[PDB]
Amino acid sequence: KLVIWGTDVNVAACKENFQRFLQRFIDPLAKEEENVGIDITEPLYMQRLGEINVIGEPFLNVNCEHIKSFDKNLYRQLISYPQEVIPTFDMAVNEIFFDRYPDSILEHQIQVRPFNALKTKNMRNLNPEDIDQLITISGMVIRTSQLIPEMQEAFFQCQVCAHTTRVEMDRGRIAEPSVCGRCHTTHSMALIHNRSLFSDKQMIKLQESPEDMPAGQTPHTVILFAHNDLVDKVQPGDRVNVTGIYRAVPIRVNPRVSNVKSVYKTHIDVIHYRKTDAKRLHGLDEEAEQKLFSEKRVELLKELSRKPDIYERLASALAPSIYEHEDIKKGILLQLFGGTRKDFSHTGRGKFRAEINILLCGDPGTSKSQLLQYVYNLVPRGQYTSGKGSSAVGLTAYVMKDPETRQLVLQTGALVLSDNGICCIDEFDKMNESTRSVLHEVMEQQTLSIAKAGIICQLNARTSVLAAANPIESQWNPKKTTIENIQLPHTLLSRFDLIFLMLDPQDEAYDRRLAHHLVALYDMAVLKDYIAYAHSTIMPRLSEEASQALIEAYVDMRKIGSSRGMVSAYPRQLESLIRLAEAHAKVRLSNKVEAIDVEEAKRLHREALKQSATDPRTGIVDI
Amino acid sequence: LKDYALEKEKVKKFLQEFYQDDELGKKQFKYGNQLVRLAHREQVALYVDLDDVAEDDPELVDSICENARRYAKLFADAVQELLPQYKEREVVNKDVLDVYIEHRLMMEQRSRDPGMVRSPQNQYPAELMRRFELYFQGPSSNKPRVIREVRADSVGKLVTVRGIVTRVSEVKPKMVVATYTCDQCGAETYQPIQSPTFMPLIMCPSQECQTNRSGGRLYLQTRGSRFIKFQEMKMQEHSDQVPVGNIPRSITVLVEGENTRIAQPGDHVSVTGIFLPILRTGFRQVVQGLLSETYLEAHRIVKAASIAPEIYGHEDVKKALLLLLVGGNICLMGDPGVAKSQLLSYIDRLAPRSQYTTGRGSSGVGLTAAVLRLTLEGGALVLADQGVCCIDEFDKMAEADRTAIHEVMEQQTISIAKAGILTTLNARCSILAAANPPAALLSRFDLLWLIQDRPDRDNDLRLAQHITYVHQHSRQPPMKLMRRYIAMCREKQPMVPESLADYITAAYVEMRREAWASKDATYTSARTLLAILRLSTALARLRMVDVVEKEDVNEAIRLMEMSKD
DNA sequence: GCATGCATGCGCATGCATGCATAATGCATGCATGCGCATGCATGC
Numbered sequence A: 001k002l003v004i005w006g007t008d009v010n011v012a013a014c015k016e017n018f019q020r021f022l023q024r025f026i027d028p029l030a031k032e033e034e035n036v037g038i039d040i041t042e043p044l045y046m047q048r049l050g051e052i053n054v055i056g057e058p059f060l061n062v063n064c065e066h067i068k069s070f071d072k073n074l075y076r077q078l079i080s081y082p083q084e085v086i087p088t089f090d091m092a093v094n095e096i097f098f099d100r101y102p103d104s105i106l107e108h109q110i111q112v113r114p115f116n117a118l119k120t121k122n123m124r125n126l127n128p129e130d131i132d133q134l135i136t137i138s139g140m141v142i143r144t145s146q147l148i149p150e151m152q153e154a155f156f157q158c159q160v161c162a163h164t165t166r167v168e169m170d171r172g173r174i175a176e177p178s179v180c181g182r183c184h185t186t187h188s189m190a191l192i193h194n195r196s197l198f199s200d201k202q203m204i205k206l207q208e209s210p211e212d213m214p215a216g217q218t219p220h221t222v223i224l225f226a227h228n229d230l231v232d233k234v235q236p237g238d239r240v241n242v243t244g245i246y247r248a249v250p251i252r253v254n255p256r257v258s259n260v261k262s263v264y265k266t267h268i269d270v271i272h273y274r275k276t277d278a279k280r281l282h283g284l285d286e287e288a289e290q291k292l293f294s295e296k297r298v299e300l301l302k303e304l305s306r307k308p309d310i311y312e313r314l315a316s317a318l319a320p321s322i323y324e325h326e327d328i329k330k331g332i333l334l335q336l337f338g339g340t341r342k343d344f345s346h347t348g349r350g351k352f353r354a355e356i357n358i359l360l361c362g363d364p365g366t367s368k369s370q371l372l373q374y375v376y377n378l379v380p381r382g383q384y385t386s387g388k389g390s391s392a393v394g395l396t397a398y399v400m401k402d403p404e405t406r407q408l409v410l411q412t413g414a415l416v417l418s419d420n421g422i423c424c425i426d427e428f429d430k431m432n433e434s435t436r437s438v439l440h441e442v443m444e445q446q447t448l449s450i451a452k453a454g455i456i457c458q459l460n461a462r463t464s465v466l467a468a469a470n471p472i473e474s475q476w477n478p479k480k481t482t483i484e485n486i487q488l489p490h491t492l493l494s495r496f497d498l499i500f501l502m503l504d505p506q507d508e509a510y511d512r513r514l515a516h517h518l519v520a521l522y523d524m525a526v527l528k529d530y531i532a533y534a535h536s537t538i539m540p541r542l543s544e545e546a547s548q549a550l551i552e553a554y555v556d557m558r559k560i561g562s563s564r565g566m567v568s569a570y571p572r573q574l575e576s577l578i579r580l581a582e583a584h585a586k587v588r589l590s591n592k593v594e595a596i597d598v599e600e601a602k603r604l605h606r607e608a609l610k611q612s613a614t615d616p617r618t619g620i621v622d623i
Numbered sequence B: 001l002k003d004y005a006l007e008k009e010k011v012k013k014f015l016q017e018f019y020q021d022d023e024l025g026k027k028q029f030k031y032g033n034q035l036v037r038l039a040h041r042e043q044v045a046l047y048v049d050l051d052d053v054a055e056d057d058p059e060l061v062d063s064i065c066e067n068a069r070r071y072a073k074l075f076a077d078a079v080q081e082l083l084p085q086y087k088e089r090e091v092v093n094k095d096v097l098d099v100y101i102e103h104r105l106m107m108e109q110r111s112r113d114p115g116m117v118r119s120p121q122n123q124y125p126a127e128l129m130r131r132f133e134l135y136f137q138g139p140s141s142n143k144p145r146v147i148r149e150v151r152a153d154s155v156g157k158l159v160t161v162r163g164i165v166t167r168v169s170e171v172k173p174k175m176v177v178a179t180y181t182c183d184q185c186g187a188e189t190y191q192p193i194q195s196p197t198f199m200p201l202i203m204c205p206s207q208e209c210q211t212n213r214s215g216g217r218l219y220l221q222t223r224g225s226r227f228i229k230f231q232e233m234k235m236q237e238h239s240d241q242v243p244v245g246n247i248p249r250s251i252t253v254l255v256e257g258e259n260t261r262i263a264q265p266g267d268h269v270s271v272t273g274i275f276l277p278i279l280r281t282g283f284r285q286v287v288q289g290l291l292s293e294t295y296l297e298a299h300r301i302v303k304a305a306s307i308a309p310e311i312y313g314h315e316d317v318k319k320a321l322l323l324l325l326v327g328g329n330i331c332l333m334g335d336p337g338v339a340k341s342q343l344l345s346y347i348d349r350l351a352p353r354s355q356y357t358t359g360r361g362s363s364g365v366g367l368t369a370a371v372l373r374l375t376l377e378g379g380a381l382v383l384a385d386q387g388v389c390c391i392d393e394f395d396k397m398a399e400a401d402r403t404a405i406h407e408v409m410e411q412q413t414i415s416i417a418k419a420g421i422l423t424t425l426n427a428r429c430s431i432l433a434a435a436n437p438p439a440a441l442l443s444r445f446d447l448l449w450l451i452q453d454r455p456d457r458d459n460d461l462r463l464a465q466h467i468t469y470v471h472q473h474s475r476q477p478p479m480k481l482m483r484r485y486i487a488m489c490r491e492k493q494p495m496v497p498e499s500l501a502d503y504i505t506a507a508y509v510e511m512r513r514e515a516w517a518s519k520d521a522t523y524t525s526a527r528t529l530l531a532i533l534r535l536s537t538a539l540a541r542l543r544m545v546d547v548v549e550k551e552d553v554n555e556a557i558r559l560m561e562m563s564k565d
Numbered sequence C: 001g002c003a004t005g006c007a008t009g010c011g012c013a014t015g016c017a018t019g020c021a022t023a024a025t026g027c028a029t030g031c032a033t034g035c036g037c038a039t040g041c042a043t044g045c
């Protein structure tokens, strides 16, 4: 037929168009930054098919904007009627693959998966005109249910003469034969489920992160259905991009009747997943794969690491719009790198906290809140809590029951979603003792234990904490000591790796510089790649020199902190020193920790608490 | 009773007739232009005024008022019949639904001979091919009614109501006509829907399936179906119309395609609607017979200078309030007896988006948000997004509320993590607070105004004279313009030049030096400089100047000095 | 002001009175007409 009913799509024309485009397309703007591992002077998609033949992956990913660049009619027809277009694309690709690479072994033929449809619109702006069309989503996963088996081909057996048949599902309904095929008995055919064929299904709930937000809009929850290999490709807390079709389903009046409601439900059928983002750091998914084809970038970063000032440069490049507080930014960078994740299960000690927890104590008239906001917006898997707004049960996990299905026994809280991430706590003073009780175990054991009615479980909460606090009077009164000003139990304070006592010196140079900077307010990719490479390619280790330096630092710290009025020292500070030294070793791209790293860690530890200016026998900071 | 054909012809001639009104000062064929736009997809809904019809025939208007639904259907059919006449060209660009409509009309022309007999079931449903909606505007002579007094006498009539919005439903598609395809034929079956629930069909009524007696079975399709935009609204009475000792009553409204996304929770709205019942089947009741539930179907929803001239004095505070309204957090502490609450009330009334809280009555769930049968509904802080919020008796609030308010002021977002709720809410609102006689207010807020009642004889006598004048003549001694002026002002965004920085820098340094000289001073920090810059930008916006000037900086400095003193 | 007690409050299970859904077959009676009988009328011789 020339056209399909209700559409303008021609099958043969689109097939030829796609086959030609798979050989013709070339784009000059896509440099080696994203045309990764491919000869740019050659056609791109044919090279992709060749790489598929090399590896044997039965799936190919296609960017929509490339097709739109080639022509607009194909783009519009793919967006409008995906059902009439994608199956043509599958066979168009398969014919080319089998012609160019005959007798290549595959378990099943090639399926094409579009991605990156340009839509920057709020989901509430969707209209019935867009039903059954291809859309994109950027969000975070919060709930994933168990797999559901759904039938595709039924198996029937004759109860009288053991004759067996198979019936393929058509239009979503199975028609079982009412008469046998060898004894002609009526209604002798019985259905056997285990002999049939099934497919996987999963339901996902996602939280929207729209670019455009109207006035007074509450957050949104989106229901997604994932099938086959797309199952288990995302985990709660992950920030992903999704490409899929927009659907509508009627709802029954009640489960025992077949009547349906007039007002329809809605959901989105996922077709494609993406993890890359141009604003936030790389996730752990891509780090666990050998995708560093950019040997140019590898060489550039390895040459940069040998330069002496790169450390400071990183502290300069972490935040352009933030002030002269270089020590804070260095501490945040060392937090980003993190310590080595050693394995101590054979020892029986348990898990050892390899991450960095930092505290910033100061007056409200400072920039600690902006630092927390920047760290939240910069790192993936980030969470932000503020004061009494959260409860003890709000963190960890809580008991629930599904509003759509019968039960969902447990649902994760803020801390678990932050697993392998960063949690920023603000107004730490106002938090009650009930939540601090949870924090006590979270901050050290990296695990949570929950024991309630019919629910006994242990969860992983491997997070890193950035806490902000205020003086009790909202002023740093110099007559009172540091401990009296902070007013926190020593058990909670001891677990913080670094404590930054923000103080106002009222220096004229500071005033001039800050005023000039603030009034004047009227490579990120290189940093991202370097951080990912260092975080995923090197395991720090230390020699005896670092060991003895650490021991000397520990005894010196114990001598200094013995005097009352100042924050006393504990054995956990030794482990904090070890973690900071390992992070500094990671910064230099060194597998060996040198005495320079230990000395730098000691310097940061001394400077953060301002113990040099502080009077050792009165506990009062001086200038 | 009158025949519908005559009135349909009258409707057609009324649509074809009027030439009168034009905005640019001429005589323009308005309904002809509307119909021409309706011919293609350049307009997808049409609103008809019942004041314009009143010129030639009032009995039509009365019959429309008492029997609104039938007349709506008649108007729709008349306009659909008129559409082919005014059509002049084919669609330049069309979407999926138009593709179905064109294809169906083309094959109808292909197959159906003019002489063959066609069964009444063989025709297309009227609303399936139609793609335009008709709505009515309430008569100006008709007086808006009260929610309490609409009763069984008003079922089926056309009414106009005014109320306050409290609940809004998210947009979801609603079925209009369902499309079925047979298992063994190329025919298409259409099922209209006029019930809250319906039962999908099974067998095919197509002629070929009947002749062959094949027993083909129908399947639903979503592409061929027609869907409309549907919303549900909850309204309440104004506090003015409630009788003595009673409680405001509520009503439910349903909203259609283009009227969707007009109203937001907390808004005051005027609704032109039809009052219709719903037949209820469910739990058994005491009294036999046919009972029903009432609901309203909407067709149209409609939503320096002197600040509080009644209050004497506080001129500088009024200037600061003006700047806060215009924009780039203000706290007032005062002795009892000085009208601080009335200023907050005036601010709430003046602002387009505003909320006013009195204390523990709105504490807790009244702020932040909560989950209700599931949908998340916000509190006062959420409603006042991109507006101005007003809080009275700030010191008496619970600590949790104060922490939430501090978070809103500094971070501008709320975070909730409790059993069942895990969200971040956007609150881009500026806060005005009132209190009675702390470092938290000085450190967090931008401007503090301390109102001390010094018993000066002249000031007290003038205040007494002003109050006597107000109480006697009911007017101060000798808002729409103010709202329009603020709206025009906020459109622009001035910028800070490079040179003035030095001057500003110098001032800041000197100010801090003075603050360091006066050991009794309490707070100076970069936040004060930011507040000064924001005030200067607001003043420059008031002058509509592209570049910040010196007078704005001087006035901001003077205002901060006056507040601190 | 911080630590503790606690009257209020909410969601899903079972128990129990009312209420709802289902659903052809066999036997009897009056109208039409055959078959045997006796009376009676009409027609021959």
Ligand SMILES: Nc1ncnc2c1ncn2[C@@H]1O[C@H](COP(=O)(O)OP(=O)(O)O)[C@@H](O)[C@H]1O
Pocket: B310, B311, B312, B313, B334, B335, B336, B337, B338, B339, B340, B341, B342, B463, B467
């Ligand atoms: N400057 C003023 N001009 C006119 N009326 C005033 C003035 N100050 C106070 N009042 C009157 O005094 C009353 C003050 O009460 P209120 O504003 O409720 O006090 P507060 O807000 O401190 O609780 C108001 O009713 C107001 O009419």
Ligand SMILES: [Mg+2]
Pocket: B340, B341, B392
């Ligand atoms: Mg008051």
Ligand SMILES: [Zn+2]
Pocket: A158, A159, A160, A161, A162, A163, A180, A181, A182, A183, A184, A185, A188
């Ligand atoms: Zn058989």
Ligand SMILES: [Zn+2]
Pocket: B181, B182, B183, B184, B185, B186, B187, B204, B205, B206, B209, B216
């Ligand atoms: Zn059919």
